């Protein structure tokens, strides 16, 4: 009933179609991947996620001079605990 | 013997102006007059304005509603 009209309709309309969602997490790692499931807490079990975050080389010169680099890692199947979710976003 | 909800009860009986201060964002303050709230202490506020204290900036907001577990204080 109201499972499909609330604000979690972004998640239950993305787990039906198995489309990918972009999640800005709390430590500012970005999870791109398909929701296999979610719940009240947005404990989203996800398949095939690109986890994309930013680094700097952290003063490799000794003079604190470098530019941030985009790093990413692949995770096959994850269980993202949903407190660390800030925003979930369906794709355009 | 009055309560906090007795103060905010009497305060939206006044509709005067108040300034909410936030959890851990000590420079960030928000001024407004409450129109309504209930028990989760989310507050709608009249013509609110963010004042940044260390630069003293007044960014106007309008009809706002602020979330309950963020406030540290309400000073009249």
């Amino acid at each position: 009933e109201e499972f499909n009209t609330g604000p979690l309709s972004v998640l239950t309309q993305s787990v039906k179609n198995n489309t990918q969602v972009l999640i800005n997490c709390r430590n500012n790692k970005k999870l791109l991947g398909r929701v296999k499931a979610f719940d009240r807490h947005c404990n989203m079990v996800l398949e095939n996620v690109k986890e994309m975050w930013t680094e700097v080389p952290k003063s490799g010169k000794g003079k604190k001079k470098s530019k941030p680099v985009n790093k990413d890692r692949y995770i096959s199947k994850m269980f993202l605990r949903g407190d660390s979710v800030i925003v979930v976003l369906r794709n355009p | 013997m009055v309560q906090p909800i007795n103060l905010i009860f009497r305060y939206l009986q006044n509709r005067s102006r108040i300034q909410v201060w936030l959890y851990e964002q000590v420079n960030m303050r928000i001024e407004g007059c409450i129109i309504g709230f209930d028990e989760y202490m989310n507050l709608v506020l009249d013509d609110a304005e963010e004042i940044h204290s260390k630069t003293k900036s007044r960014k106007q907001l309008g009809r706002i509603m602020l979330k309950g577990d963020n406030i540290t204080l309400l000073q009249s």
């Binding site: 430590n27 499931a37 807490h41 079990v45 096959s76 199947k77 993202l80 407190d83 | -």
Partner: protein, 81 residues
Amino acid sequence: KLVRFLMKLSHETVTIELKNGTQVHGTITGVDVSMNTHLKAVKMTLKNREPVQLETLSIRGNNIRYFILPDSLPLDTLLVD
């Protein structure tokens, strides 16, 4: 409730990244309803430190950022009620 999916996952070698960045690679032994994760054969790398071998660990369930499950997991027969 999705935590019930995790307590069906007894005896799986999963890694767990916490809110302190510490990656814990080990065979999961028990889950509470609050995701209190009890692990064995633990290889815990606290981040900005070298990894330490420990025989048993018990993470509190609030402090889990995410899990990492292996490739060989049948979740289509695991998330059913």
